[PDB]
Amino acid sequence: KEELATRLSQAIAGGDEKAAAQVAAVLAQHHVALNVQLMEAWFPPGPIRLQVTVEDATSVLSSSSSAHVSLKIHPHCSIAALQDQVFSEFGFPPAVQRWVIGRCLCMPERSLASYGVSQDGDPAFLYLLSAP
């Protein structure tokens, strides 16, 4: 499994399509659960200081800015890893975090970069649910 995984990225980094197909098909037949990540180096560099505005069911929204929290985090980071960092520093499990960046509710699997995060001061919203 774990060698087929290695062999998969070797085959893709290799330019070798047929070897990538034979190994990707075999992992598929076995339903192997993979993390497939791009290189950190391909992303806009960090850590970046993300401006987080926390909100809930009854909080009074306003274009008043005031990020409650700044977090240093790399753009290559998955939203799942932002949720793990936030669970560490502050106690709120992933199950109650919902992340909004720009127009999007974010998927855990996707990078911060993929939602446009790349500069210091960039704004993200942490919506905390009240009945998981």
């Binding site: 339903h31 909080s59 274009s63 909004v100 720009g102 127009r103 509710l105 500069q119 919506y127």
Partner: protein, 157 residues
């Protein structure tokens, strides 16, 4: 600069999430509705339109892999929502989730022929609850023997 617009856009969506939660809609319901329909009134859309979309997700799932039995609304919904209202992805995942679960139940003793498809449908795609139901017959005779004459003596460890 563009930071200003990201803050505005975010707030605009947090606002609808906020309205949604207080009416009993999860943020992935509200957003899935927004992405699929462009509706200005996501709560209304969910009440009136959702079930027709989930109905479609289940039939298309059945069409794409007809070996996999029949898909439940709980499975259609979960797929619809994990893919944020993308129909073609939701169908892909509805099929994939059920395929993956049949492959597990198979490796644990319980293939299509011993009722895995029916039990997965019966329990909204819940592998844990299907496994329970499928092994009931295995434990019944253990239940039925408990009061039989002359058991072996209580082992010590």
């Amino acid at each position: 600069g563009r930071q200003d617009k990201m803050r505005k856009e975010g707030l605009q969506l947090v606002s609808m999430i906020q309205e949604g939660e207080t009416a009993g809609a999860s943020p992935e319901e509200v957003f899935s509705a927004l992405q699929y329909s462009g509706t200005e009134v996501p709560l209304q859309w969910l009440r009136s339109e959702l079930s027709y979309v989930l109905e479609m997700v289940a039939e298309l799932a059945g069409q794409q892999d007809p070996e996999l039995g029949a898909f439940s609304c709980q499975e259609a919904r979960k797929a619809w929502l994990d893919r944020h209202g993308n129909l073609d992805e939701a169908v892909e995942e509805c099929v994939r989730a059920r395929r993956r679960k049949v492959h597990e139940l198979q490796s644990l003793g319980f293939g299509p022929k011993e009722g895995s498809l029916q039990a997965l449908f019966q329990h909204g795609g819940d592998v844990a609850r299907a496994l329970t139901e499928l092994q009931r017959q295995r434990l019944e005779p253990f239940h039925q023997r408990l009061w039989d004459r002359d058991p072996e003596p209580t082992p010590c460890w």
